[PDB]
Design an enzyme around this catalytic site. Structure first.
Site, PDB file in Angstrom:
ATOM      1  N   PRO A   1       0.818  -1.202   0.000  1.00 38.04           N
ATOM      2  CA  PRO A   1       0.000   0.000   0.000  1.00 38.04           C
ATOM      3  C   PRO A   1       0.854   1.255   0.000  1.00 38.04           C
ATOM      4  O   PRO A   1       1.963   1.194   0.416  1.00 38.04           O
ATOM      5  CB  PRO A   1      -0.804  -0.121   1.291  1.00 38.04           C
ATOM      6  N   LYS A  32      -1.574  -5.444   5.932  1.00 43.96           N
ATOM      7  CA  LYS A  32      -0.397  -5.740   5.166  1.00 43.96           C
ATOM      8  C   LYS A  32       0.841  -5.556   6.020  1.00 43.96           C
ATOM      9  O   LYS A  32       0.853  -4.744   6.938  1.00 43.96           O
ATOM     10  CB  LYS A  32      -0.327  -4.808   3.949  1.00 43.96           C
ATOM     11  N   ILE A  64      -3.436  -2.890  -3.381  1.00 45.02           N
ATOM     12  CA  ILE A  64      -3.934  -4.047  -4.107  1.00 45.02           C
ATOM     13  C   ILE A  64      -4.940  -4.780  -3.236  1.00 45.02           C
ATOM     14  O   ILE A  64      -4.569  -5.557  -2.355  1.00 45.02           O
ATOM     15  CB  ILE A  64      -2.788  -4.960  -4.581  1.00 45.02           C
ATOM     16  N   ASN A  97      -8.365  10.180  -1.797  1.00 45.07           N
ATOM     17  CA  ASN A  97      -8.785   9.338  -2.923  1.00 45.07           C
ATOM     18  C   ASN A  97      -8.240   7.910  -2.694  1.00 45.07           C
ATOM     19  O   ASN A  97      -7.033   7.714  -2.488  1.00 45.07           O
ATOM     20  CB  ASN A  97      -8.266   9.850  -4.250  1.00 45.07           C
TER      21      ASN A  97
END
EC number: 5.3.2.1
Lengths: 114, 114, 114
Positions: A1, A32, A64, A97
């Site tokens: 990330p 993660k 992801i 975002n």
């Protein structure tokens, strides 16, 4: 990330250890490992939110997977919390975002994550 | 909406009032209230367009809706017009990436727009 | 196509010619003429990769088409190679987000590419 924060708050207002705190907290929120978490903070920016140059932040979180309706609500509470507490930016002057990246569309280490 | 402009034009060449003008004009073109419009201008960048370091701009406009073929044409005319008139950047040396953001994928005020 | 690299490597470590080399190599890899390639390098950034601040890079490649599994692997090999050779950044400390842009979602020259 990967998390990026662009802000008009000055560099001297970003506390020492902020990068590490973001890394740790995002590892926890995303599930993660911290070794995969990248963070990027860009202070002293020339920006406005609603026409005002009071403190604000424009941010992105790319991951992801681990992106979706409930998760993004939870990330927004976490990250707005951190930006309010550490950078003194009002949560209503923050946009984040979120991008759910396909593994094939992230390059790393001479290849992609696919 | 969030509009970012990265440019090699120097900071002293960005006129006073430019962020307000962007905010106002984007509110008008998108139909969104000015209070939701965020703008960010990044001068003095190390960049090239077509291999040339002559004035150029790389930009993004993110919006929840109000993104599409005709609308994006109209935004490009507006924004290239402003970059030409205010920053003296030729419209053919400007790229603007448009993103239609899902409400669920924009964080604001401790939550998302979902 | 548009390639942006953000890095903690200092400006004085970016070699002369680097933007041209990126322009040339991306023209070759994407098949697009160099006149359409835009590049942007942002050094001296405050960032961390995996909790540490050794040299790293967070990057994006936006293209109208020419994005996909095999192509993106090939771009990653090329770009990680260049970042390692020129900026001494380890490929394992590089993320590249790939975006396949719709022609209608790229503004240029007062219009879009549609």
């Amino acid at each position: 990330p990967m998390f990026i924060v662009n802000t008009n708050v000055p560099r001297a207002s970003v506390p020492d250890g902020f990068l590490s705190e973001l890394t740790q907290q995002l590892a926890q929120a995303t599930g993660k490992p911290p070794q995969y978490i990248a963070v990027h903070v860009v202070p002293d920016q020339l920006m406005a939110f609603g026409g005002s140059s009071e403190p604000c932040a424009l941010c992105s979180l790319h991951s992801i997977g681990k992106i979706g309706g409930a998760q993004n609500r939870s990330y927004s509470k976490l990250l707005c919390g951190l930006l309010a507490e550490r950078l003194r930016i009002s949560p209503d002057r923050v946009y984040i975002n979120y991008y759910d990246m396909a593994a094939a569309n992230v390059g790393w280490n001479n290849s992609t994550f696919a």
